[PDB]
């Protein structure tokens, strides 16, 4: 579904929409031990060679790292090289793991071009949540 | 044996040091940090320490204890077995027997290039007994804002499933960012590798750590805490067979005299089938030749008693008039008010209120979310941000009012109370705005990042209901809620309408002027009802829809009753307008005395003045309820007497050789015996009346005797001089009842059944009257003296509604116990070597109790509090060395120590003189962030200090809450249950002798302690007036025992069945039914007298043909002058505007004057025919 977001600064690309699978209401809840699919319309600003995701979680105002299996969304449905102006969405799928807390927070995402400048920049608060 | 890994060299990242690697021996201690030693952990300070550890090792440990000092420290006995982990761990004499490193690599120095090895990693054998006593006997602390445990807080995870092996593990991991170095616990319980780990002793929450320091809570642990207590409730009921027990023993009384009564009347028709003469006659004679005297000499007469009236009456410019209530409803001598003299002379009277009960009715309960974990939290209505700031905005208006007085300006800041001044100055304010204390912007900023409050006011509104005396939120936002004023501001005085625990569900917001009493001065005083008479102006206009206000002042009370007293003058004169219009019809039947009754009134109004002045003369001051309610009782007696005289005149015929003053002279002297009695029965009655303590009913009392006594004499000697004068004149042209009486009244109620049914009838009346007795209410509303249209009865509404907390309580310790000494400490101890039935103990169980005694609160004493303070750990006091001077804890600390030596010894408390010593700083203390509360704001007017002869403490108390009360009964209660425990303490202290006594002390006390003797009061009251009637109608009537009797039994029916009509239409007997029935019982003889006396004085055959005779005779008089007169004035004061009018005097009155024309005109005329004395 297409989720709210807050953009922190898309310079080098166009947000068109920001789907995520499956989140019914948001903010979306996801239960622990559970796989989410992401699907990410967005329209690029610049031409980039290469293409790295990043993932920043912020608890309590502080912004947490987390790293993610893949750092190159050309394998995740962009076609490198990253042409000027082109409307491309990322598809992306995680699984939530266990032990996790039962928290709210606000997922923090950056695309970073070749030069470094974020192709697109959201931010999206979700929950974890229990067994429910 | 000895110590590895000695100092910390190396460095990880921001502050974190490595261990350095040291396997040596342990390095005793620079001397340096003995303190720390001690502080940390005292188990190893028996001196040659020899101890491995390092001063700078031990502040990093301090340092890194913040905030688990903060959650943990609040049960002593939990925190007490971590530090005594973590010192061990570190820095404990036999470290080798216990620990083995594991990785250690070289510490190049960039000092010297020097390699030291630091210990990254290494393992600690820990008990399994260890950490299961230590996880499982501090694990029930809960944490600040939330019922959780602080292990929610600190195993970095829900305590619900934070193993107990678990949360050390994160605390030894260095993955949390504050483990400098990860530590490998090993839960072993048995030695391994020839290393076995140590537990030292452990405390369980049944048992204190140290002999000061108190086990932990039943708040914050669950097994000391076991059966709640309860009283046991006796209702003491007789229920003979399931009702009153009453209904019962009456009814059945009853049953046996109706049976023995158709059982005699019945069988009676089967079987059908100069010892007295001397002192009255002289009377008669006497009477008729003063009144013949007095017909011939008219200029004279009227002459003195005009002299009479203006003598006495010129003493109406020394009027007083008495307001104050406390003079008015409290003997100046009574215990109680002994008890408010010696308080309100060495602490200060108690202070002044002005309320306000704020309610937001247009909006609904939200619901608030914390962000990080936890269950809904639900907010009252009023408890809306919006709802908030128009709340603050109107205490912000409140604020600015200065009313002036005698051309001087008070600001509401310099009549207001301020504790700790002039160092603050602010002043008491008590509203949950304080909280943010009284500022928008306080109350406006958030803590909080995008789609998302991280911390809000409702967040910072619940930690401090939790906890109302910190000096920062110190949960996410820091900002203290501790008040302007300085000083906690406690939930249940500031909210009501919440459910018991609630906060959240608050439906009222309390809000809270405390003003300043003054002691012997009367400017002040002036100047604060000025203050307070602006701010109900300003409060009554403001208009502010989305509220609905219920508001009150000091002087409201008061102004109420001299609202009321006055807009019901216009009652009393229509009342005597309609007896004058009754009385121009009924005077006789251009046949119309109309001149004489005016001349009546005015000399009624007369007496009533008369007795004004001669008492203003003497001193007594005027209370203006009675200056309303005399006049109609005075009224209606002098009506009663004039028309007996005139009636007996219009019904006389003139004899053979009599000019005029020969038939007056005759006719006075057949009626004066009578009209005689009536008046000195009803003027002693009145007057015995008067000795009761109360001065408003004991003035009264005086005022109406006085005043009935004036109004028979000058209405006998004025009045038959000016009828003799107007029969002259009356006749120059310048009886239907009696009829009815002797035609069809007299014979019909004769017959001799109906006789028998209405003594059977009325005797079961009587039955029925002493049945329903003991069920009477005591005490008065409080709510009922005021008008109905006032905002005074909302407000007692709005209290009885939604208020939690009450009156505060004192407990004043009496001067001469001694503060100075283990015992005289541990009497009134709070504490722990103190007895477990000490004066702090005591009251705090009356108050878990709670409903068997009306206390509500903690006592919140300042001894435990004292020494709290002194403690050398809390370390906020200090002096110079050499000054002895106190240094605040915010001081460059130049030179000053600790006030008591930090040695196993100083610890204990400061019995000797040194008590004293430290006691004075400590009343001086105000509210350090970093100390604590101090104790200037809240103990110095509870401690007295007394200079010289061994700096002795003065008189002290311990203020507690009352809870909630809403009725007379609920008041009486509450006092007598605060004797109880003031006694009880007394009692147990065991004094050689009775030099002094504890004792209570609240603001209603005064008012309510003649409740705790109004029944004998009562019933010595009763007993003696009707003593006295019996007595004067006993020598008076001659001396004929028998007529009298009947009389009193008569009278005593009548007041018996009054209490009865008290019963059924719920009127209580407080002083002031009190004083009606007693002053009822004295105006009854006005009936029951003039058919006796017709009875006595008759010389008919048989009984009944004298009862019959009296009765037409007499009561065709007392019929058309005392009930029908009286009854017009009852009816025109039924329509009242003060409610105790309306309820006491009308309903009394009705009562008293129907009960009475029944039983005179019914009853004893068939009593009489039946026992009547034969001669
Ligand atoms: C008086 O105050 C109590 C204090 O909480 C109120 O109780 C709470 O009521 C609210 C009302 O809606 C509930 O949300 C609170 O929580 C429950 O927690 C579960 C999860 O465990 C949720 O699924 C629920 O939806 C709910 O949020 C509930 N909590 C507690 C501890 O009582 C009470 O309502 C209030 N009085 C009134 C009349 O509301
Ligand atoms: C009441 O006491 C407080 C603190 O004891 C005083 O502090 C400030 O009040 C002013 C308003 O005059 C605010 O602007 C400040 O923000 C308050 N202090 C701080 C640090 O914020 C206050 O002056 C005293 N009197 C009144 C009327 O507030
Ligand atoms: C653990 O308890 C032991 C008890 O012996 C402590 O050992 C020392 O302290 C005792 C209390 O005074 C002394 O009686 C012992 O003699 C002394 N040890 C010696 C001299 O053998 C030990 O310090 C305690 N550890 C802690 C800090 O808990
Ligand atoms: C004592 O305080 C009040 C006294 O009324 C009790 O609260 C009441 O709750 C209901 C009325 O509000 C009724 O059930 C009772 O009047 C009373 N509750 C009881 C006693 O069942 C409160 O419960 C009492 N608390 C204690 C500690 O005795
Ligand atoms: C498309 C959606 C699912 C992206 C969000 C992925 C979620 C599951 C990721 C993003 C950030 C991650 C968090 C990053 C930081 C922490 C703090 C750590 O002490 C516990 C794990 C925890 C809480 C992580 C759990 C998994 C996490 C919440
Ligand atoms: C993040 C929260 C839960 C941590 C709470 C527990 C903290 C305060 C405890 C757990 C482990 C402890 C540390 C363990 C290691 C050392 C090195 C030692 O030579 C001095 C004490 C010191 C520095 C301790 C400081 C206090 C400490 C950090
Ligand atoms: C009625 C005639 C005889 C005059 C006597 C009037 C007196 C006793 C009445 C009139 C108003 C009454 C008062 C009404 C209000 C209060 C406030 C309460 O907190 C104490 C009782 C007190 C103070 C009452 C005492 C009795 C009272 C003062
Ligand atoms: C591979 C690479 O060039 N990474 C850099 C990263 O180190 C730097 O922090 C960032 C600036 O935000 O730019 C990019
Ligand atoms: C520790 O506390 C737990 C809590 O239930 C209890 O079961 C256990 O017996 C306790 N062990 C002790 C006090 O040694
Ligand atoms: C009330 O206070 C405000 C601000 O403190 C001030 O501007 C005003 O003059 C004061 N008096 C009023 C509003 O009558
Ligand atoms: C007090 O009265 C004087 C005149 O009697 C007047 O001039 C003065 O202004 C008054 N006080 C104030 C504060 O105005
Ligand atoms: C409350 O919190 C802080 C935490 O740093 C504490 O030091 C202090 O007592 C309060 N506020 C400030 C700003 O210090
Ligand atoms: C009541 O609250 C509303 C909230 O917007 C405010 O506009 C209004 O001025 C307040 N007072 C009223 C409506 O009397
Ligand atoms: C209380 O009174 C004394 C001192 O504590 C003692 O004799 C008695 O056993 C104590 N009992 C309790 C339950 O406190
Ligand atoms: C405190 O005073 C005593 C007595 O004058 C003196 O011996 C001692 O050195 C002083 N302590 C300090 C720290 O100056
Ligand atoms: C603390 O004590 C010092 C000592 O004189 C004083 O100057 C300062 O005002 C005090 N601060 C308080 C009591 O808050
Ligand atoms: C007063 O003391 C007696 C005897 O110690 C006790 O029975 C009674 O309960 C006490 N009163 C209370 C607890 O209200």
Redesign the pocket.
């Known amino acids: 579904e297409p989720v709210q977001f807050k953009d922190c600064g898309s310079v080098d690309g166009v947000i068109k929409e920001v789907n995520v699978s499956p989140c019914p209401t948001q903010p979306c809840q996801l239960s622990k031990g559970q796989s989410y699919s992401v699907n990410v319309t967005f329209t690029s600003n610049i031409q980039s060679k290469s293409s790295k995701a990043v993932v920043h979680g912020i608890l309590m105002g502080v912004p947490v790292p987390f790293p993610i299996p893949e750092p190159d969304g050309c394998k995740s449905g962009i076609n490198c090289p990253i042409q000027k102006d082109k409307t491309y969405s990322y598809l992306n799928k995680l699984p939530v793991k266990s032990e996790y807390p039962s928290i709210k927070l606000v997922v923090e995402w950056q695309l970073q071009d070749d030069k470094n400048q974020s192709l697109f920049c959201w931010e999206i608060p979700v929950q974890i949540v229990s067994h429910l | 044996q000895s110590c590895v890994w000695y100092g910390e060299c190396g460095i990880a990242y921001g502050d974190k040091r490595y261990n350095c690697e040291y396997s040596g021996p342990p390095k005793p201690l620079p001397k340096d940090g003995y303190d720390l030693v001690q502080e940390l952990?005292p188990?190893?300070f028996?001196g040659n320490v020899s101890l491995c550890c390092d001063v700078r090792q031990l502040q990093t440990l301090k340092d890194n204890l913040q905030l688990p000092l903060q959650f943990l420290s609040r049960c002593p006995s939990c925190f007490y077995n971590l530090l005594?982990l973590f010192?061990?761990l570190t820095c404990?004499?036999?470290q080798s027997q216990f620990l083995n490193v594991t990785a250690t690599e070289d510490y190049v120095d960039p000092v010297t290039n020097q390699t030291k090895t630091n210990v990254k990693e290494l393992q600690y054998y820990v008990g399994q007994s260890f950490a299961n006593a230590m996880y499982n006997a501090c694990r029930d602390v809960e944490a600040p804002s939330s019922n959780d445990k602080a292990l929610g807080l600190l195993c970095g995870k829900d305590a619900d499933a934070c193993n107990a092996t678990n949360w050390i593990e994160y605390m030894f991991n260095k993955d949390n960012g504050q483990a400098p170095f990860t530590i490998t616990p090993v839960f072993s319980d048995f030695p391994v590798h020839g290393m076995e780990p140590?537990n030292?002793?452990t405390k369980g929450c049944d048992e204190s750590v140290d002999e000061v320091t108190a086990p932990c809570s039943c708040q914050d642990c669950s097994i000391v805490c076991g059966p709640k207590p309860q009283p046991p409730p006796p209702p003491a009921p007789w229920t003979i067979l399931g009702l009153d027990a009453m209904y019962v023993i009456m009814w059945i009384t009853y049953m046996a005299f109706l049976l023995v009564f158709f059982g005699a009347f019945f069988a009676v028709w089967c079987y059908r089938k100069p010892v007295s003469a001397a002192f009255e006659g002289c009377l008669r004679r006497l009477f008729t030749r003063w009144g013949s005297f007095c017909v011939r000499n008219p200029g004279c007469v009227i002459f003195f008693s005009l002299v009479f009236i203006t003598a006495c009456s010129s003493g109406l410019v020394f009027v007083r008039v008495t307001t104050n209530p406390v003079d008015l409803w409290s003997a100046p001598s009574s215990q109680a008010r002994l008890e408010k003299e010696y308080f309100d002379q060495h602490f200060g009277p108690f202070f002044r209120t002005e309320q306000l009960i704020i309610r937001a009715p247009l909006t609904d309960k939200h619901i608030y979310q914390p962000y990080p974990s936890g269950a809904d939290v639900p907010f009252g209505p009023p408890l809306d941000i919006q709802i908030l700031h128009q709340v603050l905005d109107l205490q912000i208006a409140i604020e600015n009012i200065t009313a002036s007085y005698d051309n001087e300006t008070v600001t509401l800041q310099d009549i207001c109370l301020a504790p700790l001044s002039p160092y603050n100055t602010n002043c008491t304010i008590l509203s949950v705005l304080n909280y943010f204390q009284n500022s928008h912007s306080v109350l406006d900023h958030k803590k909080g990042d995008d789609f998302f409050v991280y911390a809000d006011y409702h967040t910072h509104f619940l930690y401090c209901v939790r906890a109302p005396a910190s000096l920062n939120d110190t949960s996410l936002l820091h900002d203290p809620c501790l008040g302007t004023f300085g000083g906690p501001v406690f939930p249940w005085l500031v909210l009501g309408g919440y459910d018991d625990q609630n906060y959240n569900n608050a439906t009222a917001l309390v809000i809270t002027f405390p003003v300043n009493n003054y002691y012997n001065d009367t400017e002040k005083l002036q100047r604060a009802q000025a203050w307070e008479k602006e701010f109900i102006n300003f409060v009554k206009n403001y208009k502010n829809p989305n509220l609905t206000i219920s508001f009150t002042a000091e002087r409201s009370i008061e102004d109420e009753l001299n609202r009321e007293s006055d807009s019901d003058v216009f009652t009393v004169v229509i009342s005597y307008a309609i007896m004058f219009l009754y009385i121009s019809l009924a005077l006789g039947h251009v046949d119309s005395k109309v001149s004489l009754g005016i001349a009546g009134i005015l000399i009624v109004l007369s007496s009533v003045a008369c007795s004004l002045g001669v008492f203003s003369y003497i001193g007594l001051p005027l209370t203006l309820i009675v200056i309303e309610v005399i006049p109609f009782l005075v009224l209606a007696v002098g009506v009663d007497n004039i028309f007996i005289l005139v009636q007996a005149y219009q019904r006389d015929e003139r004899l053979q050789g009599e000019t005029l003053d020969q038939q007056l002279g005759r006719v006075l002297g057949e009626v004066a015996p009578s009209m005689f009695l009536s008046s000195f029965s009803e003027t002693v009655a009145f007057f015995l009346g008067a000795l009761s303590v109360m001065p408003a009913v004991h003035t009264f009392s005086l005022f109406a005797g006085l005043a009935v006594f004036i109004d028979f004499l000058l209405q006998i000697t004025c009045f038959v001089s000016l009828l003799g004068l107007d029969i002259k004149r009356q006749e120059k042209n310048r009886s239907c009842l009696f009829r009815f009486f002797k035609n069809s009244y007299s014979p019909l109620l004769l017959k001799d059944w109906m006789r028998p049914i209405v003594i059977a009838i009325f005797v079961g009346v009587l039955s029925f009257s002493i049945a329903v007795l003991n069920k009477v209410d005591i005490g008065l509303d409080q709510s009922l003296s005021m008008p109905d249209d006032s905002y005074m009865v909302d407000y007692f509404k709005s209290i009885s509604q939604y208020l939690h907390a009450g009156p505060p309580v004192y407990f004043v310790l009496e001067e001469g116990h001694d503060y100075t000494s283990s015992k005289g400490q541990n009497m009134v101890c709070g504490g722990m070597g103190c007895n477990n039935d000490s004066l702090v103990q005591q009251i705090f169980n009356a108050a878990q109790l709670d409903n068997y005694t009306r206390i509500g609160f903690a006592p919140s004493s300042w001894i435990d509090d004292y020494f709290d303070w002194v403690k050398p750990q809390s370390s906020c006091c200090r002096v110079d060395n050499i000054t002895d001077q106190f240094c605040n804890a915010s001081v460059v600390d130049p030179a000053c120590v600790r006030c008591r030596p930090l040695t196993p010894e100083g610890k204990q408390r400061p019995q000797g003189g040194d008590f004293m010593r430290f006691l004075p700083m400590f009343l001086s203390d105000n509210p350090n962030p970093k100390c604590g509360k101090g104790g200037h704001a809240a103990y110095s007017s509870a401690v007295n200090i007394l200079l010289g002869h061994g700096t002795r403490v003065g008189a002290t108390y311990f203020m507690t809450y009352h809870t909630v009360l809403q009725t007379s009964a609920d008041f009486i209660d509450a006092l007598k249950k605060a004797r109880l425990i003031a006694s009880n303490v007394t009692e147990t202290m065991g004094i050689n002798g009775s030099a002094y006594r504890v004792f209570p002390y609240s603001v209603f006390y005064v008012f309510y302690e003649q409740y705790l003797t109004i029944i004998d009061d009562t019933i010595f009251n009763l007993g003696v007036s009707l003593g006295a009637i019996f007595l004067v109608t006993m020598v008076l009537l001659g001396c004929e025992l028998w007529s009298a009797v009947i009389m009193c039994a008569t009278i005593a029916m009548v007041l018996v069945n009054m209490f009865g009509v008290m019963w059924l239409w719920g009127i209580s007997l407080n002083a002031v039914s009190l004083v009606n029935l007693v002053m009822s019982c004295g105006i009854s003889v006005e009936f029951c007298s003039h058919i006796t006396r017709a009875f006595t004085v008759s010389m008919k055959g048989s009984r009944v043909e004298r009862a019959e005779e009296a009765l037409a005779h007499m009561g065709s008089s007392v019929f058309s002058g005392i009930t029908l007169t009286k009854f017009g004035g009852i009816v025109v004061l039924a329509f009242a505007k003060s409610q105790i009018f309306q309820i006491f005097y009308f309903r009394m009155y009705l009562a008293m004057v129907l009960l009475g024309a029944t039983h005179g005109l019914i009853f004893l005329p068939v009593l009489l025919s039946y026992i009547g004395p034969s001669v």
């Open positions: 952990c188990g190893f028996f005594n010192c061990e404990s004499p036999r140590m030292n002793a």
